[PDB]
Each structure stands twice: as structure tokens, then as C-alpha cells.
Design a binder for this molecule. Structure first.
Ligand code: HEM
Ligand SMILES: [Ca+2]
Ligand SMILES: [Ca+2]
Ligand SMILES: [O]
Length: 306
């Protein structure tokens, strides 16, 4: 069983070291907190939170970094290396990369203004990476609500609260124009924009992402507070201002009878959202972990110990 006190004797300063690393990085890269939270999400949705996503290519298995959902998108890997090295210095061969990334995600959320809590610990590191599984398990922005629900259920998160609360991760961070071009100019082969996108916001987004423009250009997920972790993400949805299709469907999908009340409840109360976010985050962090003597304590998060 994972426990928040797992390193209280072996490495009491781990969370502090992780926090210091992120604080320093945030000075030059204000996007890093969002990026790190996302790395944990993409780790957990593929064989569980086992740091499998951190492994680089080998001649026997491909890296998950080349998955459709990670390539030219996932980032912050060197920062994870930095905190890992610092933690290894403070406590040699003690903290797994899987746990390190979990703590980094929580600290990132807190540093951005979100809730503060002690995540369950005791996870161990995978002995391989899963590229095919990542391509199959990571959700896509063009997913319908039923598909999003399917994706979460597939990894072990059955609750709509899991989906709605964790989607709140889009209260900060960036998104490439490529992922919303359809909503802006030709949605579902209609030759028209997505009708669930607020028309005034549509104009703004079209200005940021013109047709035939730079598809790699970045836009903010949350037009209200781009870098602050708060419940504004949900207020946007209520006004049809969710950035990507998967965001807005939580409120506008014909299958949203169960998610609409959740969106409203999180938009109405920060406390309600923060509580739900912590609960859902811990549930995601509890997806098929390697524990006890299973797996190992990777020394270099990019390679399996030899
Ligand atoms: C519900 C399904 C989800 C879909 C389809 C989805 C999709 C996306 C997409 C398309 C991007 C933009 C990537 C890019 O432009 O390179 C992104 C970024 C991001 N997502 Fe998600 N996401 C989902 C769930 C989540 C969850 C569960 C979390 C965390 C709890 C999360 C946190 C983030 C963050 C923080 C960013 C910004 C990363 C950065 O700026 O580096 N996402 N997501
Ligand atoms: Ca994983
Ligand atoms: Ca925000
Ligand atoms: O994401």
C-alpha cells in the first residue's frame, strides 16, 4: 500500500529538494510547472505511474517520448534529471523516479497556486517503456466525451469526477494551434467552426491561429489565468470558452448529463474543485504501481539500472 510517509526516515528532504528545483526553473521557464504535472499524467496513463515515460530509446524497446501524445509536446525531462541528481546526492538509491515525478507534479500544482497535500509514496520504476501502449492509452483533444470516458476507464479511473477534476489540469499551460484548427475553420467536415466555441473567443483564437499559419504556435489553455492553478478553467467551460474539444465537451456534449453538474460545482467553489482534484490526483497516482521489491530504484531516470 502506498503511503505519504514512505520517505520520512530515508529521505525527509525529498519534497523540499523537488520544490527548490521547480522554483528555480520557473524563473526562466514559467511553463515548467504545467509541463511537469502533465508528465506525471502521461506516466500514469501508460502501465501506471512507473516512470516508464522517462526512459529513452534502446535497441530492444522504443521510448514513449515518440508517442503521438508525447512527441514535440511533452517537455521538462532535463528538469526531472536535475532534481533526481540532487535527490540522489541527498539520499543515494532511495527515491524512485516514479515517486519523484509524482512529488514534482504535486509541488508544481502547489507552486502555481493550487492545493497542497502529501502524495502517497512507495512506487518503483519500470524495467521497460511502452510506446504502443502510450499510443493506445493517451487521450486526444479530438476525442468525444464517450471516448474520453473510455480512455479514463481503460486505465482504471471509472468516475466522471476523475475526468472532470483532472481535466482541470488545463487551468494553466500551453496548447499548439494544430490541435484546434478544426474547431476554428472546419469542424467534423462541416466547413464551419465548432458551434460549442464562443463566437467572440472564436475570433480571438482565429487571430492567434490563422488558417495555414504556424501550427506549432502556442496558446493558453486558460484565457482567464494562464499560469495560475485555479478553478477558472471551469468558468470558461460554462461560457463555451474551453480551448480544445475535449475541454468543452465536459460541458456541451450530448453525453454530459453527468459531467455538467461537476463542471458547475467546480466553477462555483474553489474548495470543491481543489478537494476533487486532490482526490482524483491520488487515484490517478494509484494506478497499477510497482511496489515492494517489484521494479527498481532507477539511478538515472533515462535508463534501467544495469
Ligand atoms: C482529458 C483528456 C486530456 C486531453 C485530450 C488532453 C490534451 C492536451 C493537449 C492537446 C495539450 C497540448 C499539447 C501541446 O500543445 O503540445 C495538453 C497540455 C496540457 N495538459 Fe492535457 N489533456 C488531457 C488531460 C490532462 C490531465 C488529466 C492533466 C493533468 C492532471 C493535463 C495537463 C495538461 C497540462 C498542464 C498541459 C500543458 C503542458 C505544457 O504547457 O507543457 N491534461 N493536454
Ligand atoms: Ca507509465
Ligand atoms: Ca488558471
Ligand atoms: O494533457
Amino acid at each position: 500500500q502506498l503511503t505519504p510517509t514512505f520517505y520520512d526516515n530515508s529521505c525527509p528532504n525529498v519534497s523540499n529538494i523537488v520544490r527548490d528545483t521547480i522554483v528555480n526553473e520557473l524563473r526562466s521557464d514559467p511553463r515548467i510547472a504545467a509541463s511537469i504535472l502533465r508528465l506525471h499524467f502521461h506516466d500514469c496513463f501508460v502501465n501506471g505511474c512507473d516512470a516508464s515515460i522517462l526512459l529513452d530509446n534502446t535497441t530492444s524497446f522504443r521510448t514513449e517520448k515518440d508517442a503521438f501524445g508525447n512527441a514535440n509536446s511533452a517537455r521538462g525531462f532535463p528538469v526531472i534529471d536535475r532534481m533526481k541528481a540532487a535527490v540522489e546526492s541527498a539520499c543515494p538509491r532511495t527515491v524512485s523516479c516514479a515517486d519523484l515525478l509524482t512529488i514534482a507534479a504535486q509541488q508544481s500544482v502547489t507552486l502555481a497556486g493550487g492545493p497542497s497535500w502529501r502524495v502517497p509514496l512507495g512506487r518503483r520504476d519500470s524495467l521497460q517503456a511502452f510506446l504502443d501502449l502510450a499510443n493506445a492509452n493517451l487521450p486526444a483533444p479530438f476525442f468525444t466525451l464517450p471516448q474520453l470516458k473510455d480512455s479514463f476507464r481503460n486505465v482504471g479511473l471509472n468516475r466522471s469526477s476523475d475526468l472532470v477534476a483532472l481535466s482541470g489540469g488545463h487551468t494553466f499551460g500551453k496548447n499548439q494551434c494544430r490541435f484546434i484548427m478544426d474547431r476554428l475553420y472546419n469542424f467534423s467536415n462541416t466547413g464551419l467552426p465548432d458551434p460549442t466555441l464562443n463566437t467572440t473567443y472564436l475570433q480571438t483564437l482565429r487571430g492567434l491561429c490563422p488558417l495555414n499559419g504556424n501550427l506549432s504556435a502556442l496558446v493558453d489553455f486558460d484565457l482567464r489565468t494562464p499560469t495560475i492553478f485555479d478553478n477558472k478553467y471551469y468558468v470558461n467551460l460554462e461560457e463555451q470558452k474551453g480551448l480544445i474539444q475535449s475541454d468543452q465537451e465536459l460541458f456541451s456534449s450530448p453525453n454530459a448529463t453527468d459531467t455538467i453538474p461537476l463542471v458547475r460545482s467546480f466553477a462555483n467553489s474553489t474548495q470543491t474543485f481543489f478537494n476533487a482534484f486532490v482526490e482524483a490526483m491520488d487515484r490517478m497516482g494509484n494506478i497499477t504501481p510497482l511496489t515492494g521489491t517489484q521494479g527498481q530504484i532507477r539511478l538515472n531516470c533515462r535508463v534501467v539500472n544495469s
